[PDB]
Design an enzyme around this catalytic site. Structure first.
Site, PDB file in Angstrom:
ATOM      1  NE  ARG A  52      13.165 130.567  29.065  1.00 31.59           N
ATOM      2  CZ  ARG A  52      13.893 129.642  29.678  1.00 31.59           C
ATOM      3  NH1 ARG A  52      13.716 128.359  29.392  1.00 31.59           N
ATOM      4  NH2 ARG A  52      14.797 129.983  30.582  1.00 31.59           N
TER       5      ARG A  52
ATOM      6  CG  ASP B 217      15.938 130.184  26.228  1.00 32.50           C
ATOM      7  OD1 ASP B 217      16.189 130.941  27.204  1.00 32.50           O
ATOM      8  OD2 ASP B 217      15.660 130.687  25.115  1.00 32.50           O
TER       9      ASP B 217
ATOM     10  NE  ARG C  60       9.803 133.918  26.906  1.00 34.61           N
ATOM     11  CZ  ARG C  60      11.068 133.856  27.320  1.00 34.61           C
ATOM     12  NH1 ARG C  60      12.031 133.578  26.443  1.00 34.61           N
ATOM     13  NH2 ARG C  60      11.330 134.066  28.598  1.00 34.61           N
TER      14      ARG C  60
ATOM     15  CD  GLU D 170      19.512 133.429  27.978  1.00 29.94           C
ATOM     16  OE1 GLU D 170      18.676 134.217  27.489  1.00 29.94           O
ATOM     17  OE2 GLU D 170      19.205 132.442  28.678  1.00 29.94           O
TER      18      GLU D 170
ATOM     19  CG  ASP E 283      17.491 128.715  33.604  1.00 30.33           C
ATOM     20  OD1 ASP E 283      16.621 129.344  32.957  1.00 30.33           O
ATOM     21  OD2 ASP E 283      17.444 128.538  34.839  1.00 30.33           O
ATOM     22  CB  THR E 284      20.035 127.233  27.066  1.00 29.16           C
ATOM     23  OG1 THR E 284      19.087 128.276  26.768  1.00 29.16           O
ATOM     24  CG2 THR E 284      19.345 125.903  26.886  1.00 29.16           C
TER      25      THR E 284
END
EC number: 3.1.31.1
Length: 135
Positions: free
Chosen positions: A29, A15, A81, A37, A34-35
């Site tokens: 970002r 991400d 970010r 993590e 949403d990946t």
């Protein structure tokens, strides 16, 4: 929205990517995704997190051109970010991840919803094919 050129410095996570943007290094970002993590406070290595990370890395490392596209809402998060869509040879990384079943669509953040429909469509298709996180 306007696409702007950038240069890869390093891919950090599924991400998150570090880019040279207008002459200065910056952490980005990816918007609306949403990946799983690899660098999570707790849980540590979530399932498909290493798969998502390698996917993002492969895509940006093999591109001859990287472009960043800010949306019309807030452009940085509280960690500093940049919040953007990232393109590798014209292909949106954010979409590729969702379409491959390697991320879910996140809730919209502060006005940033230009490609939400596009991404939600990619996700529905990945769920239907039972890909990766959706298996």
């Amino acid at each position: 929205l306007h696409k702007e050129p950038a240069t890869l410095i390093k891919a950090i996570d599924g991400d998150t990517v570090k880019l040279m943007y207008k002459g200065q290094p910056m952490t980005f970002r990816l918007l609306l995704v949403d990946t799983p993590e690899t660098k999570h406070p707790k849980k540590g290595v979530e399932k498909y997190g290493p798969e998502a990370s390698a996917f993002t890395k492969k895509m940006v490392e093999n591109a001859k051109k990287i472009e960043v596209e800010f949306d019309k809402g807030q452009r940085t998060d509280k960690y500093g970010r940049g919040l953007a869509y990232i393109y590798a040879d014209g292909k949106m990384v954010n979409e590729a991840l969702v379409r491959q079943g390697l991320a879910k669509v996140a809730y919209v953040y502060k006005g940033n919803n230009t490609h939400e429909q596009l991404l939600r469509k990619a996700e529905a298709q990945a769920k239907k094919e039972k890909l990766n996180i959706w298996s």
